[model samples]
Target: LNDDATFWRNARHHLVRYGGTFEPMIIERAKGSFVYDADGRAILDFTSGQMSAVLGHCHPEIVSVIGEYAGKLDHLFSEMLSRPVVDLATRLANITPPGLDRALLLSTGAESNEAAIRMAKLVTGKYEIVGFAQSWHGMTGAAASATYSAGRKGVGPAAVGSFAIPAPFTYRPRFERNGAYDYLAELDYAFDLIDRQSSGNLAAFIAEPILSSGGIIELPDGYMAALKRKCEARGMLLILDEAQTGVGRTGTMFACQRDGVTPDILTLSKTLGAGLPLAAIVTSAAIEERAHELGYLFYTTHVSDPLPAAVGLRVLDVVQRDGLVARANVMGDRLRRGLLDLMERFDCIGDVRGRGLLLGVEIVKDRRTKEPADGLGAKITRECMNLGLSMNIVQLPGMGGVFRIAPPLTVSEDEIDLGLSLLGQAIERAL
Candidate 1:
């Protein structure tokens, strides 16, 4: 009964392969920081259901809001305005940094990014978009075009004039100045090339404050401010995609708050709904006014849908009232310390990086050489599963496999220790 053959057979027959292979066990239910498999085995949910459920699965507050909205005020026509939608928009405008005064609610990270990129193009009257070479915005039109981490081949040409610059990676620095890694110099050089190669039509530069899909690479200190200045000089809008870092994930309501650098447009999705299909793009009143004047259009079937908006509002409420943001820092520091201890014991653990609860542990063949361990990461992941833990790993070119560790913000002290202990054991067995 646990290994339902008919279910697996049906899934194989009906489902299209979307990237990775499915996990061996079926998830029956989830609560708090753990998910139960078919055999009633509890697996610690370290990935937080694709790094979205910051409030954990089926939090009472979120579940209640979801039920209330679903029963009373659910979907609506895109043209019609609803209280939940307005309240969510207003809440976003209030919580986000200054200048982010308006919002357009959507359903996914890709849709929000697409809306942001379109607005940037319409407002600037330009066609080019730029992003970090290792960024992952989304899988839709403009977002996919601006995304460079993966999935560019065999999909035909991306949007014309999509450009990318190398994101600053302190672990593997290439550009140097005065015998030190000078990422700022690298940025200047990259932009110099972009200027030379451009058609003189740069619309905007979109980036994640922390590149969650790009191996959890955090934008270095002072880098965001410098990047914004570069965009300002180019007359390009700066669009920050805080899909994974927003909503107190990085010890702040938004990751940009740490840098004190406000982007021209802020796109949020993954964490905002706490696992619901809700997304938003917030911008200044002036930018919204200009985009409105230019007749910006992103109307869709689920635009400003009442149910998700209410869920998002509840997510914000719970996050604030429960002080999850502070909890993230406390738990993150605990987890980081444990990871560091594991690193000291295991030579394969090359580096540990990231802020707040969003962290990464890079697996390598050698500490000195920092050579990528091809199959070791996969082995450790499988071992983790065997030990009743769920984790996610990302492999990219010229880099070792990076385990993305993001437990729910509502995770408990024992949960954090258990995940760390499981990871350490997995590493030991794999080694």
Candidate 2:
């Protein structure tokens, strides 16, 4: 019996609606780069299960690691330290940049970011937190406060001393100098305004290397260094959230490596767990020592648990041993070329942005005008679903819907081509 009527009825009666509309299919299983529905239809997973499953769903090694830890060393007290916890922390300290030498294993991106912001405030003795207007750090307390993209409404006041500056969006240039989009100048001006408005209690500036939920906007070259300098000048720490871009999803071990910039605090999630619930925050020894001295605390029931830590360790081992970072580069190039070809053929494909597997394709009504395509992007997304390719689209104000195409790092070339073909056909039908 393949009847899903009772299932839909139960879900509709019991489950709470989170945010966006849910897909109209029951995911029965997943493996490699595809998810199977209840009807046994294979949908190419282009969004990587919320842009996290870099190793693909139910990776064999990950499954083995989960089994090993679940039966051997599972949950523990927050104060208790286990081998897997120490091992994962040490491995993170070794792999990250030189300044990052310590780790705090957490559960999700928002939790890691919340811990980071708290530490920054305690260490810097400040309460002000700044971030990009289009950033999506997390949905927790301090993380949600620092996030300005969405969810600021319907909630009462966000945490006090929260501020934001316009992210440097090259595609939709809002700032100009010398007859061109001078993003650097825009950055300087934005800081000047922040300085004017700030109460001088600046704690930290949180950022993403590539703003995934914010239409896949990549920071222009040299922006990271300049932003770090700005934070340094203001006596504030820099917190880089690599929730969606870390763990070889962006063709590198980490996205910040490309700019040679090391943040005071680096938050990793999503990809770190590879479809599980694991996150971490790594910082310099100096910062950790100071935070410890100041009695900084972020203890939860799941903090430093052994099961996810073991999974994280195995994830790193597999990512490094299998050379998936290099694979990301190769597969990303293939996908980017296909997207570029599609852009050349279709006027609705206004822009293609991002690096490696984390890419974005913007839908517009006209190339010259760059107008948002109204409902055309939604039409294309629905068409893609009908063609057995699951895609994710993000619609922001004053911008067209952007298809965030981030397949798993283990995605094959044939799968990439298949997704490209499906997307092209969807676009054609939508147009």
Candidate 3:
């Protein structure tokens, strides 16, 4: 994966078959802050491989630990507990919000949700599952069934009994347009859905605390707490899909923390494994006891992979040891300043919203109309790639454009400034 221009030509040809493509950059290797394309261009990574690599690309410390574990142990299945299991669990206990005791390790964020959906049904003895619109859990059957953003594939007959609810985005567009706090009304709307739609059949009520796919839409303050109360009152299990919003990407340990609510079933991925593939599901002792009474709720042959656990363990350690969470808070302030400045500089900039580094720059064709700048969003992303910056645009389904900027939590203050400068340039050039 050396940085070389010639490799990108062939790479694009192969990537087209997968029905997706990214800017052509052949990577020789990356240490930190930047990735080198095949053409030897240093592409500043602002998206963190879609919010997975929290530590950054090719972190030497993390890589060394993984390399050591690879040769020392066979990739053990999670069903049979391994050394990494005990260590990983202990570390998680230290980091996760108090009362989140149980943990189930798996391969990807989607896998965690797959098991989570089943667990929700089992614990509640219900058949219906609910998720907010503009969420991206993953691509698994259960996860895909649970997702509601634009990129989500239309569900089929095999769909899990999950229903997509109108997101806070649609629930409070006028408030959002005005940049006001009335967004809390979305929580009221969701509880209405729970009462109307739960129909005594709602099992799991899941949401990405930060709304990753829906343009990093951070709900208004106290919204999550209110939503949790609604779900609790309706006997619905609240599951936080923190795959992208977890592990400090949102500046806080978990985005839900800001709202002061705790989820009954919390799932994690993204930077959980640092760069390795690992996801975890956490719940309470009561749910575990209840699921034990039920039969075959979530029994995966490969519940946990040890090598990834090694990475997960180290990542957890690094974030805490290096104070990356606090650093994210500090660096995120810089990102906000830069993004807000962008809005003032460009009329197309509709909004600059996010918590920590999990930010979105909304581009709109009409500031007054709030019409999404879809074409401009795409062009800015393209131009960012052409330069040395990386960004991905997620269009508001059936509506507008949102450019999400999710850099590694390890991103330096200066790097954030650099990324934002390149981003503003891309937006200006696109317009």
Candidate 4:
């Protein structure tokens, strides 16, 4: 068989369909903010390697720690404790909100969210869970049940008592009044329905500060605190899913910090590992003690692995030492300005939103109509790949095609400028 035929045939025969078609390339190696394909085409990874590589691909410190720990200490028995694990846990406590002094190390965003859900249910002695209508927590059982962005269709039944409320989308407000988005009004209406439909067993309300998979919808400024109040009033725990927005990806250390409202629980994943498979669930000491007394337990093979923990520690070190949090703010301004200029030039670019290193550019057929430009988004994506830039587009049923642009926080000004330039060319060619 020819090279293309051989590769396609083997991939189709062996691999199951996870989602859309895989990128048509054999990725050989990655470094910094770029990846190389089999033909040695250098592609700028604007999506940050699935929005995980905040420090950029294969960071030197992370690589060194992984190498050293893999030889000396990697995996361990579930009951065994290691210095890396302890250090990571403590560091998590220090960096998180005050009183959220406990950490449970895990792997994957889904697993961390699942554990948070279980813990909330157990601690509150309730079963019902709440999430945003377009939230994407993960693909695991509980996480998938709570996820509403995609992957919920044809999955049979979700968890019992799982409920969804309209996210506070300022761009396309459902409860629009007087040319303004009334998120509070929408929140009240949603909870009214939830209250009527619920059996009073609402255990928790899980949400992402900036919904990455949900077209990078950032909740309105004052909406978060109000949501927390609703959760508290309904005897539900507020669980913030910071899988994509945590670890300085947002200008703040955590996205929730913007609102000055702390959640009952916070789950971190994607950015925590900085390209490795590491996640964590953080909560208050009181909640941890309550769960412990209730015999809470979550154990997996890779739980508390020393190698990832060491990498995580080093990631934190580099982030602090290099002031990546502040860097995110500076680079974010540059990227945002570029995107705003693109929107001004191209009518297809509808909106530019999100924070820090994570940003979104929605494509629409008309600015006034706001009709989703799905086909245009597809064309742009293909054109981007052809032009040596990898951009991710999220196309859901009720939303416009949105390009999720999240290059590593370590990305330089030149890299950001290059991505913007490539994107402009792609958009022009696609049109």
How many collisions per candidate? 0, 0, 11, 0
Residues 314-367, candidate 3: write the lDDT tens digits.
898888889888888888888888888888988988877888878877788888
Q: Using TM-score as the measure, what is the rank order of every candidate, best first? A: 1, 2, 4, 3
Model 1: CA > 4 A from native: none
Question: Over the full model, what C-alpha lDDT does candidate 1 score relative to the true structure?
Answer: 0.94
The regions of model 2 sitting more than 4 angstroms off are 1-3
Each model's C-alpha lDDT? 0.94, 0.94, 0.77, 0.91
For the record, the alpha-carbon RMSD of candidate 2 to the native fold, in angstroms, is 0.9
User: Which prediction has more favorable lDDT, 2 or 3?
Assistant: 2
TM-score: model 4 vs. ground truth:
0.98
lDDT of 4 by residue, 222-320 (tens): 899999999989889999999999999879899988899899999999899987889999999999999999999898999888998998899999999
Of candidate 3, the 10-residue stretch with the lowest lDDT total is 169-178
